[PDB]
């Protein structure tokens, strides 16, 4: 037996391609304008006037209009441990997300598979990503069973990833789809803030920031190489990827899973770091492609907060429209962690065709997607849009 | 810009190849014959006479001579919550493993890297895998820092995976190496039982079994396609992989991360399920290669316990020597979860070279590697040995 | 009879396309470094020491290595009226150019026609352009006769046009090819300095400058819409044209045909006017295409002198390589008036193909061609390159 | 003089290799379906109804479709002594085969030498084998003269060998080629049933069996060690040989050359003996090679009769395809004695490449050839196939 004959016949040919995108959010829509009142009451911190005023500023500055949360008043009222700033509550939080993450991922995935239109039995690989809760067998196993995938589907369970991992699942899916002939990868990012939600502390203002920014949601993709013409419908193509750790960012975003759930720490100037290091990432990605005009490409950026977005824009002299799709998702859903970047892809291609532009990438050919999160990590994915 | 030219220029040519293997264990070597005494004493369960006998039986039949453990008597007497069966202790456990997993992995990596011979600046991708603890940034980031890897090394943090993930990291590495010209993947599996160690309970004998079998270890590999001849030295080649979930195995191996640490549950007959489904896994992998004599390939089997190996051996009529390398690892180190299977590859190539056999796969050409774990999941990796 | 059916059946479909280019020059190659000696000697102005120095400066800064000239020493010594600054000589000059313009054009045409590959009986339209001499029947008729074109070829005799008319014949050809199904236009620009060559005079330095810059050349093209694939071979496509007169340029470039031949006058600052008005010409042409990065298109510029190119380059911050093809033509042939810009297209497509670039437009998609000349007139032609 | 220096320089290096195979049969093709009628008429035994019915069964059970025979109706009609069951006829039979054996061997040999493509003057050794007729000088001498070999060719005249001697010539050729540097051995097996053909006798049913099974043919090989790369074309390599006498088989196949020609006696159960003793031969040959799966090697077996073939198959659980090439030669040519096994080699490698398998041995690496005949003798030759 010839291992080269086998290798040649085992591998796919063309670029890994996004063929379907579905999203899903929990039912409870929480308005940002009334959140400080709701938050401070349900965490019984109504007497912390100064702190609440700080939170009100934070919410107002967030550029977030609303968020969807699995956590409701009824559920919060049955879990006083969760409403405290730091009480033993991991078991209760786990019990919530081990079920909700896959539950939410399934609605997103079913929509994705529906759009794709091909038999779910053709899905050969599955990537599942969450930063909320962990279990064995994991949420990949629960998703295989809930959706009816084949039991030999090849699974990649990405846990406790945090906010750069929309970029990470794309990076992963690229190699899966491109190295295996026939492979169709179902990618699901599902994030539920039930593990990070906690009461305010005036000595933990970074944790408070998290309470104003993070929201719940799940997005799913179908990725594969060599799409069947006029059967499958390419949306975006992946061409090149990178991942790096910004210099002088130790501790920028830390997260520790403890008996009191998932804590969140912000120990540097994330928007500063991100914007100081973004040009380097862009030249690494686009110089080999001969492009240096960063307004000539379409943009997708992980909206940790609005500040990141404004400083990147300011820094590069991006026209304001570049970040539109990113800012529309931040406005209607808040920072959905790893899934955010997939919602933005969906928003972008839908406005693009609804507005009758020539490509899925706002009428432009080449585009870039960035994931930002713990490390401080910068994930880059280079994309090419599709006609119509 | 032509994406097909970029794609063809971006990918590697030949089979993903294991180019180096290194292992490491904690200094504390724990004899199994007297393990019951040590264990029942440190967990204050000496009065539990019958249960002690059962444990002695378990240890006697485990076919494990010893294990290396991060946990010491000193560490255990300092952490009573950890010595009881079910006390709040995840914080103390995290503090331990968030540090020890990367430390132990580093040890392993250094060895692998010294063997490889090439500058660690040529490591393009890093896979880190563990089932003990989680944190953000993860152990992949800690390892990058600890080893002085390039900040732009592409990371894959596989957390809370379980005992089949030795198979998982290989199937991941194969696609990383094969789709990327020049890629060199540093693959590190590191397991520390500090998160699962707990006191005995007579109504939870499955839990007890785990305290008899699991041990600490790290193993690291260098994986790459298109090795530089006479410079780099191929050990094994990966040719085909698969992952499947066994029918009728719901709940066979569960593990939940809770406030009391990682619990372990065994709800079916794992040895029975594995041996009942191993034949299907084998024809799936070898029929396309035209091989049906399972005594004619070299074997690496995740050794969850000896009965999995015994019943598989009995089922297929494998000659007794087939599982030699597998049993040697079990004997000297116990079940090191995800790393076990990597320690086995090392043992087998070392013996084969040491004893001047014709190939690294015990003088045989084709081989199989299996990972068994939660789902019930079976990971299969088809390998080809290398001459000498 | 339906005129709309006739109209729809009469017109072509796609963009006017350049299908072949050929050039020709007189055999006499005249080195610029020693041009002052030759020139001052043949015009008997050796005693004019200072003026000679000025000419040497002019020649040194012209960035012209050499020019091809119909005029020889033999021809000049036979025509003293032609060697003085202002003597009655138009008859002697006409006798020269009425014959040499069609002769030289024929040379160019033959080459273009050989490249095209199709029978010259398929040439439906002929554009002839020159700034040296006039006659009746014109040079278009002579060329028809000389090449054995069909007697019913539709002719356009463009006489006394000046240095922007390389742009003019393209804008004319575009409408001829596009409005006429099956039309193939033979476009011939042929300039001979025999009509402008004259002796030096210290009160007429603008005249002197011309004797330093102008050179002889012909270039021919085949232009047609709806090329027969794999038969005919598109080089460039024309997409949009414009012609405008620069404000504040009255008298910038005048030329009068008199009894002493064609005189040349330069009354303003041509390099200044061009560079001051080039940006308006560019947004007019490219804003509707959405392109504002002028380094991202290929460039062809009429090289009246090097300072036009230098000040345009400086004005827009064009990278130095943009004007490479333009400067190569200036260097090897000087300012060949109306033909210059056609020689440049040839140079650029030849280099691009020779060097295996992705397109005939130096690997770029869109391009611009400019003609500068009397009025002050600016001709603009927007081009699209062809893959390979 | 150093005998060791000489010995070292006289011997070849690598395994004796088959480099060309040619076959040849007499023109008269005799169909088995009509043979009993033809046979019983020409031997004037048409009145022996019961006997003829026995013969019809024998032919039908033979699995032989046709045979080529030198003996024709015309020749048989000029030799009534030959058509009787036992009449003086050796001189007439000799006169036929002393001429026909070499005549037939030459056509086979010329084809072999043609395939080899090297000058016949490079043939250094000649093995000739027949079980039909004997003379002095023998058929080796006649073949040297008929083919133009050099007079110093080294000759090995194997006479009255009988049916195991295809294996015997290979065994012999191996030592000739391997011990002499440069040696190229021409091996010719040529068998003509003119010496054994005789009338039926109802008291000599074994002799009758011979009349239904044996056919005429000649096969030739070119055997040598150290083939010239990309000049000579290895087909099969010989690695090990054995010859043995089965226990309790005295008289199984006897043959005596008498005044009435060559008689044939079958005094035991040949298929029983052969199949009872074949496993022992196989372990002697393949245990040292570490192979015990007799379906993993390619097969060539001397088809004394179909019964031998079925009992060997049955006994070892050979898949039915193993004996395909052996059964195709038995079908189209019958039992050609010593040459049969060489025809099978030819059939095997030709179907193998015509069917696009990876090796000359049906895509397998290792193979075995067995010769069976008087003694009862078992000849074993271990072979290795060649890529493509």
Q: Report whether D166 contacts D189 (CB < 8 A).
A: yes
Q: If you measure CA to CA, which chain A residue comes closest to C293? A: A293
* A27 SS3 class: coil
Strand partners, C67: C30
Q: A385: part of which helix (H) or strand (E)?
A: strand A377-385
Q: If you measure CA to CA, which chain D residue comes closest to B364? A: D290
What is the greatest pairwise CA distance in chain D?
Answer: 76
- Binding-site sequence positions of D for CoA: 54-61, 307
Q: Report whether C369 contacts C375 (CB < 8 A).
A: no
Neighbours of D240 (CB within 10 A): 17
Tokens found for residue C154: 């539709």
Residue C215 among known ligand-binding residues: yes
Return d(Cα A23, Cα A342) in angstroms, integer.
Answer: 8
Q: Radius of gyration over alpha carbons of chain B, in Å?
A: 21
Q: If you measure CA to CA, which chain B residue comes closest to D293? A: B293
Return d(Cα D225, Cα D238) in angstroms, integer.
Answer: 10
With contacts defined as CB-CB under 8 Å, which chain D residues touch B297? none
Shortest CA gap D303–chain B (Å): 29
Q: Hey, CA dihedral for B33, B34, B37, B40, is it positive or negative? A: negative
Shortest CA gap A293–chain C (Å): 8
In the block, tokens 């006083």 appear at: A80
Tokens found for residue B69: 């453990």
Q: B207: part of which helix (H) or strand (E)?
A: helix B205-213
Tokens found for residue B78: 């300092």
Nearest CA to A343 among A328, A358, A353? A328
| Per-residue CA distances from D171 to A169, C4, C97, D166, D178 (Å) | 64, 94, 96, 9, 11
Return d(Cα C105, Cα A120) in angstroms, integer.
Answer: 69
Return d(Cα B110, Cα B283) in angstroms, integer.
Answer: 38
| Per-residue CA distances from C290 to A318, C34, C284, C287, C293 (Å) | 16, 48, 11, 5, 9
| Per-residue CA distances from A284 to A108, A313, D61 (Å) | 33, 19, 79
Return d(Cα B224, Cα B150) in angstroms, integer.
Answer: 17
With contacts defined as CB-CB under 8 Å, which chain B residues touch A138? 160-161, 374
Shortest CA gap B117–chain A (Å): 24
Residue B198 among known ligand-binding residues: no
Q: What are phi and psi of A242, to 5 degrees?
A: -150, 160
With contacts defined as CB-CB under 8 Å, which chain D residues touch B293? 293, 296
Residue C150 among known ligand-binding residues: no
Distance in angstroms between the alpha carbons of the first and the last residue of chain B: 45
Q: Does D292 touch chain B (CB under 8 A)?
A: no
| Per-residue CA distances from A271 to A267, A318, A334, C113 (Å) | 12, 16, 17, 63
Angle at CA B11, nearest 5°, toward B9 and B12?
115
Shortest CA gap B212–chain A (Å): 20
Best residue in D296, D297, D362 for a mutation probing chain B (most B CBs within 10 Å): D296
Q: Does D317 touch chain B (CB under 8 A)?
A: no
What residues have CB less than 8 Å from B211, skipping those under 6 apart?
B39, B55, B197, B198, B200
Return d(Cα B267, Cα B376) in angstroms, integer.
Answer: 11
Q: Report whether A133 contacts A344 (CB < 8 A).
A: no
Q: Report whether B212 contacts B44 (CB < 8 A).
A: no
Return d(Cα B357, Cα B354) in angstroms, integer.
Answer: 8
Q: Report whether B275 contacts B315 (CB < 8 A).
A: yes
- Residue A171 is nearest to which of B135, B154, B246, comparing CB atoms? B154
Neighbours of chain C (3+ CB pairs under 8 A): A
With contacts defined as CB-CB under 8 Å, which chain D residues touch B357? none
* D210 SS3 class: helix
Nearest CA to B246 among B374, B91, B100? B374
Q: Does B181 touch chain A (CB under 8 A)?
A: no
With contacts defined as CB-CB under 8 Å, which chain D residues touch B296? 293
- Residue-wise DSSP of A31-66: ESTTHHHHHHHHTT-TT-HHHHHHHHHHHHHTT--E
Neighbours of chain B (3+ CB pairs under 8 A): A, D
What residues have CB less than 8 Å from C354, skipping those under 6 apart?
none
With contacts defined as CB-CB under 8 Å, which chain B residues touch D286? none
Please return the burial class of A9, using the count of CB atoms within 10 Å of its CB with bins 0-12, 13-18 and 19+.
exposed
Return d(Cα D319, Cα C81) in angstroms, integer.
Answer: 108
Are chains B and A in contact at 3+ CB pairs closer than 8 Å?
yes
* Alpha helices, H only, C73-193: 73-77, 80-83, 90-116, 139-147, 165-178
Q: Hey, CA dihedral for D171, D176, D177, D183, is it positive or negative? A: negative
Q: Report whether B181 contacts B10 (CB < 8 A).
A: yes
| Per-residue CA distances from C27 to A110, B90, C216, C345, C346 (Å) | 77, 93, 10, 22, 20
Q: Does A372 touch chain B (CB under 8 A)?
A: no
Neighbours of D310 (CB within 10 A): 16
With contacts defined as CB-CB under 8 Å, which chain B residues touch D296? 293
Nearest CA to B201 among B81, B50, B85? B85
Q: Report whether C58 contacts C212 (CB < 8 A).
A: yes
Q: Report whether D271 contacts D310 (CB < 8 A).
A: yes
Angle at CA B2, nearest 5°, toward A388 and B7?
105
Tokens found for residue B310: 């015994």
Neighbours of C184 (CB within 10 A): 25
Q: D262: part of which helix (H) or strand (E)?
A: strand D261-266
Asked if A239 lies within 8 A of B180 by C-beta distance, the reply is no
Neighbours of chain D (3+ CB pairs under 8 A): B
Q: Hey, CA dihedral for B278, B281, B286, B291, is it positive or negative? A: positive
Q: What are the CB-based long-range contacts (under 8 Å, 24+) for B39-43?
A: B39/B200, B39/B211, B40/B200, B42/B73, B42/B76, B42/B77, B42/B83, B43/B83, B43/B84, B43/B85, B43/B198, B43/B199, B43/B200
Return d(Cα D167, Cα C51) in angstroms, integer.
Answer: 108
Catalytic one of B83, B163, B189, B340: B163
Nearest CA to D383 among D21, D9, D7? D21
ω into residue D247 within 30 of 0, thus cis? no
Active site residues of C: 163
Complete domains list, chain D, with CATH = 1-234 (3.40.47.10), 235-387 (3.40.47.10)
Return d(Cα A26, Cα A14) in angstroms, integer.
Answer: 36
Asked if A7 lies within 8 A of B1 by C-beta distance, the reply is no
Q: C270: part of which helix (H) or strand (E)?
A: helix C270-286
Q: Does B10 touch chain A (CB under 8 A)?
A: yes
Return d(Cα A239, Cα D125) in angstroms, integer.
Answer: 66
CA atoms within 13 A on the CB side of A316: 27
With contacts defined as CB-CB under 8 Å, which chain B residues touch A191? none
What residues have CB less than 8 Å from A99, skipping those under 6 apart?
none
Q: Hey, CA dihedral for D23, D27, D29, D30, is it positive or negative? A: negative
Q: Hey, CA dihedral for B81, B86, B87, B90, is it positive or negative? A: positive
Shortest CA gap B362–chain D (Å): 13
Resolution in units of Å: 2.0
Interface A–B counts its CB contacts (< 8 A) at: 175
Strand partners, D262: D257
* Alpha helices, H only, chain A: 3-10, 35-42, 49-61, 73-77, 80-83, 90-116, 139-147, 165-179, 205-213, 270-286, 306-316, 324-333, 340-354
Q: B276-312 burial by CB neighbour count: b if 16+ within 10 A, else e? A: bbbeebbeebbeebebeebebbbbbbbbbbbbbbebb
Tokens found for residue B84: 């009881």
Q: Is C362 left (phi over 0), alpha (psi -120 to 50) or beta?
A: left
Question: How many residues are recorded in chain B?
Answer: 388
Q: A237: part of which helix (H) or strand (E)?
A: strand A236-245
- Binding-site sequence positions of A for CoA: 54-61, 307
With contacts defined as CB-CB under 8 Å, which chain A residues touch C296? 293
Best residue in B295, B296, B317 for a mutation probing chain D (most D CBs within 10 Å): B296
In the block, tokens 């794999």 appear at: C230
| Per-residue CA distances from C127 to B61, C123, C187, C338, C378 (Å) | 100, 11, 5, 12, 20
Return d(Cα B56, Cα B53) in angstroms, integer.
Answer: 5
- Residue A237 is nearest to which of B3, B237, B375, comparing CB atoms? B3
Beta strand D298-301 pairing with D366-373: parallel
Return d(Cα C202, Cα C197) in angstroms, integer.
Answer: 16
Beta strand A377-385 pairing with A366-373: antiparallel
Q: A182-196 burial by CB neighbour count: b if 16+ within 10 A, else e? A: ebbbbbbbbbbbbbb
Q: Does A295 touch chain C (CB under 8 A)?
A: no
Please return the burial class of A144, using the count of CB atoms within 10 Å of its CB with bins 0-12, 13-18 and 19+.
buried
| Per-residue CA distances from D39 to C84, D69, D73, D76, D77 (Å) | 123, 12, 10, 10, 12
Q: Does A142 touch chain B (CB under 8 A)?
A: no
In the block, tokens 């008087």 appear at: D374
Please return the burial class of A138, using the count of CB atoms within 10 Å of its CB with bins 0-12, 13-18 and 19+.
buried
Tokens found for residue D232: 């000579």
Shortest CA gap B293–chain A (Å): 16
Q: Does A306 touch chain B (CB under 8 A)?
A: no
| Per-residue CA distances from D385 to B182, D19, D112, D165, D353 (Å) | 37, 12, 19, 21, 12
Return d(Cα A210, Cα A216) in angstroms, integer.
Answer: 13
Best residue in A131, A162, A175 for a mutation probing chain B (most B CBs within 10 Å): A175
* C377 SS3 class: strand
* D329 SS3 class: helix
Interface A–C counts its CB contacts (< 8 A) at: 3
Shortest CA gap A207–chain B (Å): 15
D163 is catalytic: yes
Asked if B136 lies within 8 A of A6 by C-beta distance, the reply is no
Shortest CA gap B315–chain A (Å): 22
Return d(Cα A126, Cα A108) in angstroms, integer.
Answer: 14
Tokens found for residue D194: 């003119």
Residue ranges of A 227-286 with Cβ closer than 8 A to chain C: none
Q: Does D293 touch chain B (CB under 8 A)?
A: yes
Q: Report whether D189 contacts D126 (CB < 8 A).
A: no
With contacts defined as CB-CB under 8 Å, which chain A residues touch C293? 293, 296
| Per-residue CA distances from D211 to A37, B214, D35, D161, D206 (Å) | 111, 76, 10, 19, 9
In the block, tokens 């790369």 appear at: D229
Q: What are phi and psi of D41, to 5 degrees?
A: -70, -50
Using N-to-C axis directions, what is the helix angle for C49-61 and C35-42, rounded to 10°? Answer: 140
Neighbours of chain A (3+ CB pairs under 8 A): B, C
Residue C346 among known ligand-binding residues: no
Displacement of CA D72 from its chain's centroid (Å): 22
Strand partners, D280: none
Nearest CA to C130 among C154, C103, C110? C103
Q: B255: part of which helix (H) or strand (E)?
A: strand B254-258
Return d(Cα D226, Cα D14) in angstroms, integer.
Answer: 6
Beta strand A66-68 pairing with D154-159: unpaired
Return d(Cα B193, Cα B335) in angstroms, integer.
Answer: 10
Q: Does B125 touch chain A (CB under 8 A)?
A: no
Displacement of CA D316 from its chain's centroid (Å): 23
Residue C216 among known ligand-binding residues: yes
């Amino acid at each position: 037996v010839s291992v080269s004959e086998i290798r040649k016949a085992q591998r796919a040919e063309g670029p890994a391609t996004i063929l379907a995108i579905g999203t899903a959010n929990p039912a409870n829509c929480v308005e940002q304008s009334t959140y400080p009142d709701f938050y401070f009451k349900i965490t019984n911190s109504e007497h912390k006037t100064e702190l609440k005023e700080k939170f009100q500023r934070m919410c107002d500055k967030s550029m977030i209009k609303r968020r969807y949360m699995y956590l409701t008043e009824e559920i919060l009222k049955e879990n006083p441990n969760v409403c405290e700033y730091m009480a033993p509550s991991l078991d209760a939080r786990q019990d919530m997300v081990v079920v909700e993450v896959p539950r939410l991922g399934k609605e997103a995935a079913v929509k994705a598979i529906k759009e794709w239109g091909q038999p779910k039995s053709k899905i050969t690989h599955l990537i599942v990503c969450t930063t909320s809760g962990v279990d064995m067998p994991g949420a990949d196993y629960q998703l295989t069973k809930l959706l009816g995938l084949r039991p030999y589907v090849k699974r990649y369970m990405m846990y406790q990833q945090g906010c750069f991992a929309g970029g990470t699942v794309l990076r992963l899916a690229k190699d899966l789809a491109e190295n295996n002939k026939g492979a169709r990868v179902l990618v699901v990012c599902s994030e539920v803030t039930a593990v990070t939600f906690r009461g305010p502390s005036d000595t933990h203002l970074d944790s408070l920031v998290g309470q104003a920014l993070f929201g719940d949601g799940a997005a799913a993709l179908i990725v594969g190489s060599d799409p069947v013409p006029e059967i499958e419908k390419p949306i975006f193509e992946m061409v090149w990827t990178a991942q790096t750790i910004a210099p002088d960012s130790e501790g920028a975003i830390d997260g520790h899973l403890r008996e009191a759930g998932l804590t969140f720490h912000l120990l540097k100037d994330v928007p500063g770091i991100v914007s100081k290091n973004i040009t380097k990432a862009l030249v690494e990605a686009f110089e080999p492609l001969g492009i240096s005009d960063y307004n000539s490409i379409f943009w997708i950026a992980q909206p940790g907060g609005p500040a990141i977005l404004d400083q990147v824009e300011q820094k590069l002299a991006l026209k304001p429209e570049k970040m539109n799709a990113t800012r529309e998702v931040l406005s209607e859903y808040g920072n959905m962690s790893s899934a955010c970047v997939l919602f933005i892809l969906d928003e972008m291609r839908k406005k693009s065709t609804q507005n009758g532009l020539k490509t899925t990438g706002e009428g432009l050919e080449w585009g870039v997607l960035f994931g930002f999160g713990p490390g401080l990590t910068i994930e880059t994915v280079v994309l090419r849009s599709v006609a119509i």
